[PDB]
Design a protein around this ligand. Structure first.
Ligand code: CL
Lengths: 145, 145, 145
């Protein structure tokens, strides 16, 4: 009865918040997932989170989301965003809304981060708002429904 | 005494034929392998099929094909065709004929699919003929040996 | 005692296993032995790691961050020219990182001319064959002390 949203954390994201606190902050993947769960309860949906450093494991989770008729997918694939055509063609299989998000303003960083290979297979993109990027992406998917 | 040919299916190809039949058809990897097995028997050769979504598993299968003195290799690496230099340098270890193939006319799709990073390490390429691309590739490999 | 980590990249398990006349016989085992011999001479410890999985490489780099490795040597193979995932894993490190190659990559195919690691390494050593590894270990020890 409840809509299911899948959160896909990308390569190197298990290391969020484990670097120098003064320069990189302390936000961890665990805190992000808690904030997503907090907002999900108010929105009346379920959020399941998945993190991997393996491109094949990411694609196979996407395949599973297609077969399990997931209602919406949020993805911050990390560096994969800028070259992994395999994940791009995995996301293309999905028929539910796909929301791309980034904590940082990728369009103002190194040139290679300015381009996303997912642009044609996602509804839209959100970047630059830190932790709030995740919550805004969850909001975007729920409003799509 | 029989020649052994290895068929390498690439990333996301386990999902062949599991999408909308009206838009994507119903051709599955299982149906492809059966038609390959039928042609191999008619041609007097052996065909072994392998699919993976892991770039390392694909490279390691190629290493195994080199050590096992495989007679010819057919590869449809999927999206890996357009960026995986790792699979490219794996194919370069082979000394048997290598045939690159695609079901679709990749040179008439998105620009990133126009270029194959395998071009310098394969005998040639076959694309655009759907199921027949696999059967033509097997014929090409047998004639190369 | 100072610890240096040697990271061997994709396809490198096949070093020395190709045609000896054309590709030589230098193996990863022989390289690691020479590294251990020089490490004892230099008064440091060397640990070697090889993988064909991009995710496994990034996770070894995460472990190198947690274990407070003194220096990292990396010859990522073909990943050098496209794996932004490994690049962003290396960016987490705060110890000196030395990129190395046996061949003169800047005089090979154009795609090998560029390393996506250049902004996250101290420097690069290429072209000196087996000596590239030994020179890189010397570079890393001098960077620490
Ligand atoms: Cl609200």
């Amino acid at each position: 009865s409840m809509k299911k949203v899948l959160m896909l954390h990308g390569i190197n994201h298990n290391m969020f918040g484990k670097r120098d606190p003064v320069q990189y902050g302390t936000i961890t993947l665990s805190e992000i997932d808690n904030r997503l769960q907090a907002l999900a309860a108010e929105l009346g949906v379920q959020v399941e989170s998945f993190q991997t450093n393996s491109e094949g494991a990411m694609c196979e989770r996407i395949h599973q989301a297609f077969e399990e008729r997931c209602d919406a997918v949020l993805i911050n694939a990390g560096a994969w965003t800028h070259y992994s055509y395999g994940i791009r063609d995995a996301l293309a299989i999905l028929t539910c809304p796909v929301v791309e998000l980034h904590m940082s303003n990728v369009h103002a960083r190194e040139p290679f981060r300015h381009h996303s290979v997912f642009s044609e297979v996602v509804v839209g993109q959100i970047c630059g708002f830190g932790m709030e990027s995740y919550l805004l992406a969850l909001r975007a998917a729920v409003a799509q429904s």
